[PDB]
Design an enzyme around this catalytic site. Structure first.
Site, PDB file in Angstrom:
ATOM      1  N   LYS A 197       0.854  -1.187   0.000  1.00 48.68           N
ATOM      2  CA  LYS A 197       0.000   0.000   0.000  1.00 48.68           C
ATOM      3  C   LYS A 197       0.886   1.233   0.000  1.00 48.68           C
ATOM      4  O   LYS A 197       0.634   2.173  -0.752  1.00 48.68           O
ATOM      5  N   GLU A 229       0.607   5.094  10.716  1.00 48.01           N
ATOM      6  CA  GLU A 229       1.661   4.342  10.015  1.00 48.01           C
ATOM      7  C   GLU A 229       3.046   4.572  10.652  1.00 48.01           C
ATOM      8  O   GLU A 229       3.190   5.372  11.575  1.00 48.01           O
ATOM      9  N   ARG A 230       4.073   3.843  10.199  1.00 47.39           N
ATOM     10  CA  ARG A 230       5.395   3.743  10.832  1.00 47.39           C
ATOM     11  C   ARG A 230       6.123   5.083  10.903  1.00 47.39           C
ATOM     12  O   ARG A 230       6.277   5.769   9.898  1.00 47.39           O
TER      13      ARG A 230
END
Lengths: 50, 464, 329, 514, 464, 50, 36, 100
Positions: free
Chosen positions: B159, B185-186
């Site tokens: 993604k 997210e990261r």
């Protein structure tokens, strides 16, 4: 490896004899020290002279 | 006089007030944490009124070290974020404080992150096709300039490689302004994106907002609204065309599910919140192109356990003009970008909008891959040769078409070391027209992997 | 090399276990020495003085609507008591207890009468038809405000009536001058019902007919006010612990003087020359007048230990011995 | 001995002073099955570390109006109604410092190994936030794992998170213990920049597994620099829940001082099964697979602690190797897909390859590293640059051709190359190779020098060649170590030696090689 | 002083106590049932403190005929079993009362069943192999001294004979002892085991602990810890090696889930207790070796639905170190003890723990038997004549190998009168090395059945 | 009445779905952001209608 | 001491009759019956 | 102690009483039978497991090796021999002969 393992086992046996002998000896000296350290701690636990 | 904390339940804080001083919904409340290395001013957002001047808040920083009975002050306005032409170039947390240098933006115009979406009189449908230069997207899933686009996928299917590809396809040459929302997210990807946008020199015209994984569910949901409230400023007041990359909008509904179980509302299907569709609606409607002014949203949507039926994916599937359903199966074949051709769909794939020659090809390709997928239950047991000749002819081109929907992306260079390719829409349509008419059935399947256009297919076939 | 480090780890176990032996012997010897010094009443008087001089150097159970309504109800009771007399107050208290029994038993009536509602005139009408012929008018004048206010649960009306009946009964001790005596008898009943687990658990008879508990108190357990407060409290006990309720009576009784109660632990018999200093330093520490409930005990010999509200200041030979033995290497 | 023994207790006694500062004492009002509710304590902080009369500790989670819903850590059997509970006045925190190196500790940071108390530098709060998007920098220098398959195909950069996901009894622990053992070649050099130090967090593992690891780390000399956190299978859900966090909080104190840290979590599935237990005892309603909604906010908050810091924050790093047990290789399950979405790649260990004897059992294609390839040293990156793709196309080509009579010579050459690369990548347990030996071992296979050697001899062929090149021609290994590059003059000098060794070699069946 | 019952809901009983006398959890409490037809001394175990001096208990016996307000007396210690050499020869319930002679054992030392596992520093750091002396077990599935072995039994597949055998091995080779934890034993097959061990005369060196299915899930859960508390006495205080059988460890897990549901705790996963892996931890981490002495275990394990991923078998297999499997397809050939050589496995069968020679011989025996288990389809459908000279040369060895895994054993002494045989590990390895290299191919299959090693093979073969 | 329309003071309407002894469980049909504790509500006299 | 003598007097002070307080769906709850 | 798994496909295939032999089991086994029933029926579970392997070859009965063709056609007759009409329970003296 076998020679060094025999040496390590011999060193471990020598340490067991040395530390057992020392342990009795140091406990006699420590018994006298314990009376002095206990009297100091008796002042610290009361917060005053004893 | 001001309020006091009464009850604490991880990131949810219940506070009481004097009889007449009760705050409204969505006000920002400050409280003080006064212990050790974690002493901080705590931003609370009011989520409910419980009666007798109690209000239940959600906490935007971790509540560790908060104490019952600390004073809580109502700021009398919602959480507000800096907006302005000087917002571009910087990196913000959900609360609109710059991570690069905390004194920045405190003098700007600040907008409340809670807003009504544009009234129905100002909405109109967007139908102008967005040239991305990826074969499977421009052919089968044509993206909409000023629409909402999504990238559904499992874990580790790509993604975020598609989002950082689309930054290189669109945002590098796009004449407008880009906002990037990092939703759950990261942090590592936030840093590798920020240093990339600096090296590509795109950073001068983009604002980044991050509410990454390490943050409590209050800010891990309110970051999406903050990033959107920057984009709504560029759309409305600056009159720009806007890009709004959201990655990952499943973490918005997930952080909603965490706070809901702590707010003590009854669990829905598979333990989501009730209001899953109303909270997702309140985000997803605001991100629309009103008549005079477009906003090209692009959203990664995680699909938990690869279960494409899961209520969060099934709820966000309604809000979208193009959907790019990535698949574990297509990823296992190494057929990057891993877009599943039969599941992905676009609302502008109509002959009135793309023209007859595109639409004919994009239905012949889908008929072929559909027939191949409806033979897969036989293929798995017997292999190819037990098929009839009219089916075996089809499966031989279906496997070529399937591999030819792969491409060497600009973002793939950091893994494969090969450069990235761009294929124009006309050379995309022509190639799949020739494939579906059978022109290439003498070339081996390995000739089609990870290759840009017909000239580069010919070269790779001659390498074999 | 592994053998050489293994010998040093073996020495480490010897010198550590040696130190545990020395440390345990030193603290046990110190414990004998300090216990023998502590035996003198002069040494205890010096220990409490050293503690006191060290300290010199150094409705909230209810939700918001109920808290506001109770504060207004007590504010009206302060006006009603301003014209009251003891032979009236003992009747006001027995009558408020009697309606608290009615509301506790007729739980349908209480669930309507407590109903939180700004338009409260219907609820006053219900109380008026039910009570006006049954009970004296001064109780109706106080129950009018108890019903017209807002309560956070149906319980909190019965809690406010019970607390008002208790206030009315405390007022007899305040007007007669027995306030110190009733405080002492409430701490006496508080300690004995804590030391007597059979009779206090049997007094927690909210699953049984309350007149049996009332007759038990009359036979087993004195100032007629303290007896009346206990008999009123067991009647309305509603699953609270009996000793803990008597402690909440005593906490209210001091709170009518504006003060708070500190429980105190000492070797034995803390003199008045101690009590005046201890109260004065506690008054500095907590910013209030105070009273001391002296719970003397030999197992906490030497120094002084005190608890009030949620905090404790706890300097005793037995507590400091635990601090010394646990700090060993 | 006796002078220092008596002096230390004399100094302890001299230091001992009154603890008479007042504290809030509460009472337990309810206890059961791992939790307890405490009344009183009006000034307790949320996530304060409470203490109970048996010396047992607990975390103040749910602060209600008139109660404090603690979680008990350790022997909750010792907790009962009416027990006094007191504030420690510290948020949920553990002692930290260099004194933990070589120790085995419970999650509270108390020694479980039965040696002395730990001389901690300070306490650190477990819930202190991870370094933000501006404090970090791009992962740039490698952990050598010393496994041929992993350092070739899925390279672990410092400050990467790399998921060693697999099935039970698949060598997940054996890959992490090989990774921790390998670092001793760097720990002997005194500079804090080569020198990695390790934490190994055992969550819910058998005590005999943790004792076996402790002994294998003593045999390799890794216990000079490894801290074990032990929450063995007997310990209550409170310890199995905290064991990863205290493992990271030990690590973070070194990471922020500018040291390099490796954390192994073994196993995060047994933390997820423990936080599920704490959540369901607290009656917080379940989501998917009966885990609570915030089981993602368990692992993500834990693994985002792992980072590479910028020079502004001292340039340290922490590398997280979480393990996960799947069940029958369901990589699409909930907890697997949570951790695959947090971490920067996976080393999916397949139990079918492990039973066939391919060890370590790295299932390529589904195994990947998404940060790796930046940090992998240039020589390794030159030799391995195709090896991932060459193995994936071998797995498909074999699964096809095993059921065909015959195939074309180019495909048959690719198949025989692939089968010899698979025999080249396997290696025995507790034998971590130095990177200067790994790159040569992969040069043999990728450049095709194994094409004259039969699949029955290939592992022995590499094993004798890497000792020969360690005994003479050592300027290849020394050159690779001292300049990181397989230069043209090292490549020709290697091919001049491989051919002399091929004539010196004889397979167990067939001829001498060429 | 004593407490009072105040609620009863099936097996669950709530007991009120005085403020100072509230028992610590996992104490045992005695209660009276005085109704004449159901008179009992009802035993309760304390599970939770509900607050207000009230304790939630789970009843070890049926609560039928309990009265509200009956007296409950606290014993001031946990459920405690008799321990000593005097428990050998006897059968007990989960509460440490004898079934063969009531009031037996009350004079002994009693140990509390709820005690911690060994301290971390007392554990052994390497897996010593158990030389059981069974040819199949020592070679193909080496057992672990202080490890747990799964035992997938069946109806009539010699499971009770292998149990009687393994009791004789530990009693006569090691000078050890056995304990049998009958976790939910069917009362019929519990009596059939008691009389069979008595007829074998092995009962004199075994202690049986039966938690029959008659009983509420309180005792079916605690019986496994009662048997382990007898075994822990033999390991710690006597210093014998022990063999703790458990039958069936799934019924321990199940009984634990039924107590959890009775206590009103929310279920986990497929409906187990949330505490599952921690209370399976409390049982399994305690089966281990210390100070040169051990508790080996054999655990019959049920697998619901044949699903090896179900949380109950999966938490069980997270512990155990070897798997023995018994097959009717081998028992019907007369190949006693009927251990399936290929379905069974061990984690000690690796060339680090066993010698390289042992690992090589076991991998070759498995290869030969895997070929033969593939060829058995051809043998049955087409007959032996369909096979090549190389395949019949393999089948000749494979037939003899599967026969040579059979043994004359001390359980079979009961019927045949011939003494049972012990085969040393070195003789077993050397025998299968020579047999797999074909050095006995000229002997008939009947020469290899039920034989006590290589010198005894020569003796049968020359006399045949 | 059950399913009566309720006027809240921001012009916004709601519907009385539950009727308890002392409380009415109203759903809000519109922008609920303007709703808060303590403000007046007027009954419409009208069952839910359009 | 005297508490135990009083508790004995109370226990001496205490057919039995209950009364149905709830009924529904095949269940009835009975208050009283202290010796049931 | 045992299970007589009745199955609805075996009931429709004509195999009434529909007991799925080879997954139905009795843990008591031979001890519950008279000696004449043990001697006669002991081989019956082996013959019906062998038929339950060979039944896939019913389409190739001419090609199948003759020594197992005599297990397949036996097996089919042992399945017919285990069909039985309701309310007709056989005395043990009769079903010993029927299995013989």
């Amino acid at each position: 490896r076998a020679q060094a393992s025999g040496e390590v086992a011999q060193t471990l046996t020598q340490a067991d004899q040395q530390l057992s002998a020392q342990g009795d000896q140091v406990r006699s000296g420590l018994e006298s020290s314990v009376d002095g350290l206990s009297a100091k701690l008796a002042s610290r636990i009361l917060g005053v002279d004893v | 006089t001001a309020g006091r904390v009464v009850r604490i339940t991880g990131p949810v804080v219940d506070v009481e007030f004097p009889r007449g001083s009760v705050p409204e919904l969505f006000n920002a409340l400050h409280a003080e944490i006064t212990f050790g290395a974690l002493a901080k001013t705590l931003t609370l957002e009011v989520a409910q009124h419980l009666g007798d001047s109690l209000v239940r808040c959600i906490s935007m920083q971790p509540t560790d070290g908060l104490v019952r009975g600390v004073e809580v002050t109502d700021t009398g306005a919602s959480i507000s974020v800096p907006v302005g032409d000087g917002v571009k170039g910087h990196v913000f947390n959900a609360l609109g404080d710059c991570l690069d240098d905390p004194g920045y933006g405190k003098d700007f115009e600040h907008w409340s992150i809670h807003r009504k979406p544009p009234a129905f009189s100002d909405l109109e449908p967007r139908t102008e096709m967005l040239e991305t230069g990826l074969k499977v997207v421009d052919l089968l899933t044509p993206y909409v300039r000023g629409g909402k686009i999504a990238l559904f996928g499992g874990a580790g299917v790509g993604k975020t490689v598609l989002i950082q590809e689309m930054i290189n396809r669109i945002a590098r040459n796009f004449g407008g302004t880009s906002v990037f929302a990092g939703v759950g997210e990261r942090t590592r990807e936030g840093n590798d994106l920020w240093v990339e946008l600096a090296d590509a020199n795109v950073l001068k015209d983009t604002a980044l907002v991050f509410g990454q994984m390490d943050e409590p569910p209050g800010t891990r949901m309110r970051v999406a609204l903050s990033a959107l409230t920057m984009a709504e400023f560029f759309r409305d007041e600056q009159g720009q065309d806007v890009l709004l990359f959201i990655d990952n909008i499943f973490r918005f509904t997930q952080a909603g599910s965490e706070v809901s179980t702590l707010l003590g509302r009854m669990p829905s299907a598979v333990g989501y919140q009730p209001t899953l569709a109303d909270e997702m609606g309140e985000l997803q409607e605001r991100i629309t192109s009103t008549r005079g002014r477009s906003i090209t949203s692009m959203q990664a949507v995680y699909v938990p356990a690869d279960d494409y039926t899961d209520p969060a994916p099934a709820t966000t599937f309604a809000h979208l003009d193009a959907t790019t359903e990535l698949s574990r199966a297509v990823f296992s074949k190494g057929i990057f970008p891993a877009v599943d051709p039969l599941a992905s769909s676009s609302t502008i794939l109509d002959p009135a909008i793309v023209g007859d020659e595109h639409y004919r090809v994009a239905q012949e390709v889908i008929r072929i891959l559909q027939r191949y997928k409806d033979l897969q239950d036989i293929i798995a047991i017997l292999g190819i040769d037990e098929l009839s000749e009219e089916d075996k002819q089809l499966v031989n081109r279906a496997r070529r078409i399937e591999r030819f929907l792969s491409q060497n992306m600009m973002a793939a260079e950091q893994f494969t070391g090969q450069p990235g390719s761009t294929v124009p829409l006309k050379e995309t349509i022509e190639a799949f027209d020739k494939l579906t008419k059978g022109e290439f059935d003498h070339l081996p399947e390995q000739a089609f992997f990870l290759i840009g256009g017909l000239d580069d297919l010919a070269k790779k076939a001659e390498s074999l | 090399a592994q053998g050489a480090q293994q010998i040093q780890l073996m020495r480490q176990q010897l010198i550590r276990q040696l130190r545990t032996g020395l440390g345990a012997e030193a603290v046990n010897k110190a414990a004998e020495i300090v216990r023998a010094h502590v035996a003198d009443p002069q040494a205890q008087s010096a220990t409490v003085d050293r503690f006191l001089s060290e300290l010199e150097q150094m409705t909230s159970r209810l939700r918001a609507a109920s808290r506001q309504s109770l504060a207004a109800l007590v504010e009206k009771f302060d006006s009603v008591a301003g014209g009251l007399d003891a032979d009236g107050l003992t009747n006001l208290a027995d009558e408020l207890a009697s309606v608290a029994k009615l509301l506790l038993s007729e739980t349908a009536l209480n669930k309507h009468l407590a109903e939180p509602t700004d338009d409260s005139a219907p609820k006053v009408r219900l109380l008026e038809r039910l009570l006006s012929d049954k009970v004296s008018a001064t109780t109706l004048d106080l129950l009018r405000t108890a019903v017209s206010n807002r309560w956070s649960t149906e319980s909190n009306l019965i809690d406010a009536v019970e607390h008002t009946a208790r206030l009315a009964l405390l007022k007899r001790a305040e007007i007669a001058g027995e306030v110190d005596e009733v405080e002492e008898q409430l701490f006496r009943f508080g300690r004995v019902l804590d030391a007597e687990p059979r009779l206090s658990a049997l007094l927690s008879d909210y699953t049984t007919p309350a007149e049996g508990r009332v007759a038990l108190l009359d036979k087993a357990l004195v100032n007629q006010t303290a007896a009346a407060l206990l008999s009123q409290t067991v009647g309305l006990l509603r699953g609270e612990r009996a000793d803990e309720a008597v402690i909440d009576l005593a906490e209210l009784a001091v709170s009518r003087r504006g003060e708070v109660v500190a429980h105190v632990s000492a070797a034995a018999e803390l003199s008045d020359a101690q009590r005046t200093r201890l109260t004065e330093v506690l008054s500095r520490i907590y910013g209030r007048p105070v009273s001391v409930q002296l719970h003397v005990d030999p197992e906490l010999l030497g120094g002084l230990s005190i608890t009030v509200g949620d905090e404790v200041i706890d300097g005793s030979i037995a507590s400091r011995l635990a601090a010394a033995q646990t700090g060993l290497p | 001995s006796a002078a220092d023994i008596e002096g230390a207790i004399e100094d302890y006694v001299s230091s001992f002073s009154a603890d008479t500062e007042r504290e809030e004492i509460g009472t337990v009002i309810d206890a059961g099955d791992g939790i307890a509710h405490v009344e009183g304590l009006p000034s307790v902080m949320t996530q304060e570390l409470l203490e109970f009369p048996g010396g047992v500790l607990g975390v103040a989670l749910n602060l209600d109006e008139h109660s404090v819903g603690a979680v008990i850590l350790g022997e909750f059997e010792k907790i009962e109604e009416g027990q006094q509970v007191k504030r420690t006045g510290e948020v949920l925190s553990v002692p930290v410092g260099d004194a933990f190196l070589g120790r085995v500790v419970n999650p509270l940071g108390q020694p479980i190994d039965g040696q002395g108390d730990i001389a901690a530098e300070t306490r650190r709060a477990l819930e202190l936030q991870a370094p933000s998007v501006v404090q970090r920098q791009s992962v740039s220098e490698p952990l050598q794992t010393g496994i041929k398959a992993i350092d070739a195909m899925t390279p672990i950069g410092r400050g990467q998170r790399q998921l060693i996901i697999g099935d039970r009894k698949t060598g997940k622990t054996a890959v992490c213990v090989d990774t921790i053992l390998n670092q001793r070649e760097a720990w002997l050099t005194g500079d804090p920049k080569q020198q990695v130090r390790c934490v190994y967090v055992a969550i819910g593992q058998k005590g005999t597994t943790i004792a076996s690891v402790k002994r294998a780390l003593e045999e390799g000399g890794a216990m000079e620099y490894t801290t074990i956190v032990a929450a063995p299978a007997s310990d209550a859900a409170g310890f199995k829940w905290l064991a990863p966090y205290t493992g990271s909080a030990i690590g973070q104190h070194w990471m922020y001082n500018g040291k390099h840290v490796l954390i192994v979590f073994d196993d995060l599935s047994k933390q997820a099964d423990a936080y599920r237990a704490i959540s369901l005892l607290l009656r917080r309603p379940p989501g998917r697979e009966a885990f609570p909604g915030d089981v993602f906010y368990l692992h993500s908050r834990l693994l985002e602690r792992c980072a590479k810091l910028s020079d502004e924050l001292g340039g340290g790093s922490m590398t997280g190797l979480p393990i996960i047990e799947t069940k029958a290789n369901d990589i699409s399950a909930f907890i697997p897909t949570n951790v695959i979405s947090i971490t920067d790649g996976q080393c999916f260990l397949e139990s079918d390859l492990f039973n066939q004897g391919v060890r370590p059992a790295i299932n390529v294609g589904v195994s990947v590293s998404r940060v790796g390839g930046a940090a992998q040293i240039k020589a390794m990156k030159e030799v391995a640059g195709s090896l991932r793709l060459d193995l994936s196309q071998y797995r498909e080509l074999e699964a096809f051709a095993a059921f065909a009579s015959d195939l074309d010579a180019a495909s048959k050459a690719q198949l025989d190359r692939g089968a010899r690369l698979v025999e080249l990548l396997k290696q025995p347990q507790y034998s971590p190779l130095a990177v200067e030996e790994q790159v040569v071992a992969i040069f043999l296979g990728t450049q095709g020098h194994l094409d004259s050697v039969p699949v029955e001899d290939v592992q022995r062929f590499e094993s004798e060649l890497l000792e020969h090149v360690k005994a003479s021609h050592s300027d290849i290994f020394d050159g690779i170590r001292e300049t990181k590059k397989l230069s043209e003059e090292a490549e020709e000098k290697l091919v001049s030696v491989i051919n002399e060794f091929k004539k010196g070699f004889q397979a167990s069946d067939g001829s001498s090689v060429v």
